[model samples]
Target: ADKELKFLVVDDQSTMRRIVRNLLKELGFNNVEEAEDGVDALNKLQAGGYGFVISDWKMPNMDGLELLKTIRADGAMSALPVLMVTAYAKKENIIAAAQAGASGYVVKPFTAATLEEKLNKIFEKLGM
Candidate 1:
């Protein structure tokens, strides 16, 4: 599954983006790309071919929630899988994300094991 899956890691911080990318690589996923913010992520998605998106919540232009809503509303990309990765782990935030159609959610300062577990859960739920 990892070999064939392509991931988009979206975050304003280059360090965080690199961390997620490396973690995914370590988990056997090599086809990973980075986007600086939600707007950049949307542009990439429009360009095509990403299987999954892991996005940070707070960003300058277009936050992750907005991005998720946009993807859900866009006919061409409505079914795309989105995983919200954020430092804002508040209950309301999580509930809002779930309502916005996130395929999964992960709090920041996470471990590689946690990321793997979340991805696995998402995969199982989606029957990927």
Candidate 2:
């Protein structure tokens, strides 16, 4: 999965993006890019070739939920894997993400192990 997968890490904060990118690299996923918000993410997506997305829930110019919805709405991109990463870990939020076609959900301040587990779960679900 790591070898063939290209990931988009979306967050308004550079620090958070850096953290996620580094963690993905540590997990043996070297192909990763960052986006500041959903619009930016979509622009990158349109440019092509991303296997997965890890996005923050709260961001200006389009939040994670909206991003997920946009991705799902697109005919060609609807099946793309999206994992929402948020500080909000409430049950309702998690349920909403799942409803919006998120492949997985991760709360903020998570360990590398947690991220890895979530990725694995998503991969298995997609049979990747």
Candidate 3:
């Protein structure tokens, strides 16, 4: 596992971002950045160093679906892991994210153990 892997937390809720950040730090990921929404996420994404992305679905300006597809369309950062962390647990949304090339999906109110499990699973899947 690359402990130095940088994480980008994209969520409208400031509190949620901090919660994820805290969990990430507990999991040994200290190099993390926060983004308010998808546009800001992309703005920060332009100057890349991010290995993974944790994004929420219901953003104000741009939905995570659009953001996810945007990254998938770009060959440069297409391989980056984008883990969807949202309250939407609908099958349609999950299918949409899968089509958009999301690296993983986790429903909201996830525990730290589940997050770690998903993170490790993604790393293993991508051989990162």
Candidate 4:
């Protein structure tokens, strides 16, 4: 509760967005927020204080990786951790996201258990 681990949950579907937010809350992060797409996510991110991102790959106006790139390029938030949550489970896509600086990856239709494990792994690695 004392940590500032605010999250940005990005997905085109309102249901999925809420699902992610709920999952985050269950994991003890009450500062979760939603964004309909990458552009919206980026805009809100530019507004500041979102330390984590969980986004879908397929979205209109922009996609998760594009947002990842923009975040990486921006000096102010270049090191902000990003977690990709999408239907794409292709190895290439996973590699691409890693190359693009994703701190974590979770495929769609995932369990809260899986999400918890992956997110914990990231935080562990970062010593957060």
lDDT of each: 0.91, 0.93, 0.93, 0.89
Model 1 residue 70 CA deviation (Å) reads 0.5
Q: What is the lDDT of residue 29 in candidate 3?
A: 91
Q: What's the distance in Å from true for residue 70, model 4?
A: 0.8
Q: Each candidate: RMSD to true structure?
A: 0.9, 0.9, 0.7, 1.3
lDDT of 1 by residue, 28-124 (tens): 8999999998889988898888899999999989998999999999998898889999999899999999999999999988998899899999988
State the lDDT of candidate 4 residue by residue for 73-99, as single tens digits.
999999888989999999999999999
Ranking by lDDT: 2, 3, 1, 4
Model 1: how far is 31 from its true place, Å? 0.7
TM-score of each: 0.96, 0.96, 0.97, 0.95
lDDT of 3 by residue, 1-128 (tens): 78999999999999999999999999889999999889999999999898999999999888898899999899888888999999999999999999889999999989989999998999999898
lDDT of 2 by residue, 20-43 (tens): 999998888899999999999999
Error of 2 at 73 (Å): 0.9
lDDT assessment of candidate 3: 0.93
For TM-score, the strongest prediction is 3
Question: Poorest 10 consecutive residues of model 1 by lDDT?
Answer: 1-10
Query: So what's the TM-score on candidate 3?
Result: 0.97
